[PDB]
Amino acid sequence: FSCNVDGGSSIGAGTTSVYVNLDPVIQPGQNLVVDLSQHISCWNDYGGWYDTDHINLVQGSAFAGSLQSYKGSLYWNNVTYPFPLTTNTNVLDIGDKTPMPLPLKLYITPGVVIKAGEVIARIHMYKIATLGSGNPRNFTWNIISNNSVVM
Numbered sequence: 001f002s003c004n005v006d007g008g009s010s011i012g013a014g015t016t017s018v019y020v021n022l023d024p025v026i027q028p029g030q031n032l033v034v035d036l037s038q039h040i041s042c043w044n045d046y047g048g049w050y051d052t053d054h055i056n057l058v059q060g061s062a063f064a065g066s067l068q069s070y071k072g073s074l075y076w077n078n079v080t081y082p083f084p085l086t087t088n089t090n091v092l093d094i095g096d097k098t099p100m101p102l103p104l105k106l107y108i109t110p111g112v113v114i115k116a117g118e119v120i121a122r123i124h125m126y127k128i129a130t131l132g133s134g135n136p137r138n139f140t141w142n143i144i145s146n147n148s149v150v151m
């Protein structure tokens with residue numbers, strides 16, 4: 001099982017920065033959207049649904065931190081969860097070699113509120129396959145804005 005960010009080199013585990021362009025202003029009482037399907041994709045390294053991968057997001061995934069005071073929602077594969085995550089999400093099954101953009105969106109409920117270049121969320125993703133032990137692996141996606149977000 002492998003992923004990449006913005007079509008870059010393959011990733012098999014570990015922590016990766018994911019840079020995102022956000023709305024430069026965050027309106028009071030309105031959600032700021034961080035569409036991660038636009039950046040992260042993963043695939044089965046054989047294809048053909050032979051050793052199918054099973055992917056979920058993990059309890060404890062949260063805002064960073066410093067910025068933990070915020071609340072929000074995390075959309076993952078047909079379900080919208082409160083964020084930070086207090087439980088593991090549903091499982092997404094990956095069996096094609098064609099990359100699948102992750103069905104993942106973060107919603108952030110509100111001078112500069114978000115600083116470009118700082119980690120603003122840490123999303124832990126868990127993989128286990130089907131054959132043998134399943135060869136479980138952990139990924140962490142460190143979400144970083146390319147731009148300031150204000151008021």
Ligand SMILES: O=[N+]([O-])c1ccccc1O[C@@H]1O[C@H](CO)[C@H](O)[C@H](O)[C@H]1O
Nearest residue numbers: 001002012044045046051053129134135
């Ligand atoms: O993870 N890999 O870098 C990798 C590259 C080529 C072939 C298998 C492979 O890993 C294998 O992939 C299969 C299907 O995705 C399962 O995830 C299995 O657990 C993994 O070891």
